[PDB]
Amino acid sequence: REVKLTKAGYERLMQQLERERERLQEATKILQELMESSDDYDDSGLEAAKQEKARIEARIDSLEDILSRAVILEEGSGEVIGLGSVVELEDPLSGERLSVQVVSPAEANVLDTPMKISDASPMGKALLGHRVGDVLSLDTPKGKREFRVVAIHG
């Protein structure tokens, strides 16, 4: 599917990619050291090292995919998230899709779909004023996750 990013969204993901490449270099060094180690009680350490390297590689592949196919949108384009806005989000690393609607505190209900999020909550305040293409780190009921804003509507 097409990928739209604002200049800020692209910037955030590229910075994240740079950090992930750093982690990959470190993870690779660790793996190499263990492969050349002379004291091997068992392979638990090697397996963990390979698992971490793979975890990082998967994130890098997802980031490179999104960044390489992204179309950079013009600033101040489309709708902007406010009270009443229904927002479609997509995790750039997992592809998971989630939708939410920013509502007044008294209308909040995290069990609905879209999730009715209070504009006064950490997630709500983090969404206010953003546009399609922006990339945000949100405090969801499942924890902290990164999402790209895919659509905004009534």
From Swiss-Prot:
Keyword Calcium present in the record's keywords: the answer is no
> A Pfam family this protein belongs to?
GreA_GreB
Q: What is the effect of changing residue 133 to C?
A: Lacks inhibitory activity and is insensitive to pH
- Signal peptide (from-to): none
Keywords, A to Z, come to:
Coiled coil, Transcription, Transcription regulation
List where this protein forms a coiled coil. Answer: 1-72
- GO BP term, pick one: regulation of DNA-templated transcription elongation
| Entry's Gene Ontology molecular function annotations | DNA binding; RNA polymerase binding
Instruction: Please name the Gene3D superfamilies in this protein's record.
Output: Transcription elongation factor, GreA/GreB, C-terminal domain, Transcription elongation factor, GreA/GreB, N-terminal domain
What does the record give as the function of this protein? Inhibits all catalytic activities of RNA polymerase (RNAP) by partially occluding its substrate-binding site and preventing NTP binding.
Family under the similarity heading:
Belongs to the GreA/GreB family.
Subunit (UniProt): Interacts with RNAP.
Q: Please state what the annotation says regarding this protein's domains.
A: Inhibitory activity is regulated via a pH-induced conformational change of the structure. At pH above 7, Gfh1 is in an inactive flipped orientation that prevents binding to RNAP. At lower pH, Gfh1 switches to an active orientation, which enables binding to RNAP and inhibitory activity.
Listed name of the protein: Transcription inhibitor protein Gfh1
